Each structure stands twice: as structure tokens, then as C-alpha cells.
Amino acid sequence: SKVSEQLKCCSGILKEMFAKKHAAYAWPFYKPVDVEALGLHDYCDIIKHPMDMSTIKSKLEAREYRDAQEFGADVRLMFSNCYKYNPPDHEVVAMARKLQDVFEMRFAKMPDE
Ligand SMILES: Cn1cc(-c2cc(NS(=O)(=O)CC(F)(F)F)c3ccn(C(C)(c4ccccn4)c4ccccn4)c3c2)cc(NC(=O)Nc2ccccc2F)c1=O
């Protein structure tokens, strides 16, 4: 099915996002932001739907995403939360932009038929 194939591409993109070659900028997105350990007392107030790569991985496996668009929405939610909460000069934002570039360039090759 077109959907099965799209999901495989999504699985491949997320696997690449976890790969050692991208770890220097991907690592802060591997798991949910630990608001307690980082002392981000206002994070929950500011961000309504936290998202991270391990959460996306778990959702893909459980077959939560019906298609590439649903999967893409959660990847873009992860980056948007970073752009929303952090000051634009924060290092983590620079890292988000590098990981988003890897994501967008490969997600743009999604099979179209
Ligand atoms: C998506 N996301 C993720 C994180 C984040 C998560 C971590 N680990 S984790 O367990 O949570 C998730 C996991 F496992 F995947 F890695 C660590 C461990 C160390 N750090 C540093 C040293 C740091 C600095 C620069 C670049 C990268 N890492 C750190 C320490 C203190 C304060 C900031 N940064 C982390 C940062 C923070 C956000 N935002 C943010 O830290 N904002 C902020 C902090 C202080 C002042 C102003 C701010 F805007 C955010 O969005």
C-alpha cells in the first residue's frame, strides 16, 4: 500500500535522525525535555503538547500514524515547541534547525505514488 511504503520512509527518516552522524545536534531531542532536571518551571505553561523522537518512535511502532502527514506533524511539533519556548539565539535552537534540515530534505523525497 502507498501508506505502508510512506510509513517505511518515515521509519527510515527517524532512524537516520537517531544515527551517530547527526548525534552532535540531534541528542537533546532524543527523549522528552526533562523539565524537572533542567529547572524549566514555565515549560508546561508555555508548551501544550511536548514531543520528542522517542515518543515518535513509540507511536510509529504502535501504528498510531495513519500516514506520512501524521508522522510529519509530530516531527514539526517537536521543532515548533523548541522555536516557541527557547530564545532564538539559544544553542538548542541552532541544533533544532540542523536536525530539521536533515528531516525536511529526506521527508521531501517521500514516495508520491
Ligand atoms: C528540546 N530541548 C532540549 C533541551 C536539553 C535537554 C537535555 N537532556 S533531556 O533529558 O532533557 C532530553 C534528551 F535526553 F533528549 F537529551 C540536556 C542536557 C544538557 N543540556 C544543556 C547542557 C544544553 C545546552 C545547549 C545545547 C544542548 N544542551 C542545557 C543545560 C541547561 C539549560 C539548557 N541546556 C540539555 C538540554 C533544552 C531545551 N530548552 C532550554 O533549555 N531552554 C532554556 C534553558 C535555560 C535558559 C533559557 C532557556 F531558553 C529544549 O527545548
Curated annotation (Swiss-Prot):
Chain ranges of the Bromo domain: 1-110
Tissue expression profile of the protein: Ubiquitously expressed.
Cellular location(s): Nucleus; Chromosome
Site feature (Acetylated histone binding) residues: N86
Variant or mutagenesis effect after changing Y83C: In CDLS6; likely pathogenic; reduced acetylated histone binding
Processing after translation: Phosphorylation by CK2 disrupt the intramolecular binding between the bromo domain 2 and the NPS region and promotes binding between the NPS and the BID regions, leading to activate the protein and promote binding to acetylated histones. In absence of phosphorylation, BRD4 does not localize to p53/TP53 target gene promoters, phosphorylation promoting recruitment to p53/TP53 target promoters.
Function: Chromatin reader protein that recognizes and binds acetylated histones and plays a key role in transmission of epigenetic memory across cell divisions and transcription regulation. Remains associated with acetylated chromatin throughout the entire cell cycle and provides epigenetic memory for postmitotic G1 gene transcription by preserving acetylated chromatin status and maintaining high-order chromatin structure. During interphase, plays a key role in regulating the transcription of signal-inducible genes by associating with the P-TEFb complex and recruiting it to promoters.
Note: JQ1, a thieno-triazolo-1,4-diazepine derivative, and I-BET, a benzodiazepine derivative, have been tested on tumors with success. Treatment with GSK1210151A (I-BET151, a I-BET derivative) has strong effets on mixed lineage leukemia and promotes myeloid differentiation and leukemia stem-cell depletion.
Domain notes: The NET domain mediates interaction with a number of chromatin proteins involved in transcription regulation (NSD3, JMJD6, CHD4, GLTSCR1 and ATAD5).
Disorder named in the UniProt entry: Cornelia de Lange syndrome 6: A form of Cornelia de Lange syndrome, a clinically heterogeneous developmental disorder associated with malformations affecting multiple systems. It is characterized by facial dysmorphisms, abnormal hands and feet, growth delay, cognitive retardation, hirsutism, gastroesophageal dysfunction and cardiac, ophthalmologic and genitourinary anomalies. CDLS6 inheritance is autosomal dominant. A chromosomal aberration involving BRD4 is found in a rare, aggressive, and lethal carcinoma arising in midline organs of young people. Translocation t(15;19)(q14;p13) with NUTM1 which produces a BRD4-NUTM1 fusion protein.
Family per record: Belongs to the BET family.
Subunit field text: Interacts with p53/TP53; the interaction is direct. Interacts (via CTD region) with CDK9 and CCNT1, acting as an associated component of P-TEFb complex. Interacts with RELA (when acetylated at 'Lys-310'). Interacts (via NET domain) with NSD3, CHD4, BICRA and ATAD5. The interaction with BICRA bridges BRD4 to the GBAF complex. Interacts (via NET domain) with JMJD6 (via JmjC and N-terminal domains); the interaction is stronger in presence of ssRNA and recruits JMJD6 on distal enhancers. Interacts with NSD3. Interacts with NIPBL.
Name this polypeptide is given: Bromodomain-containing protein 4
Species assigned in the record: Homo sapiens (Human)
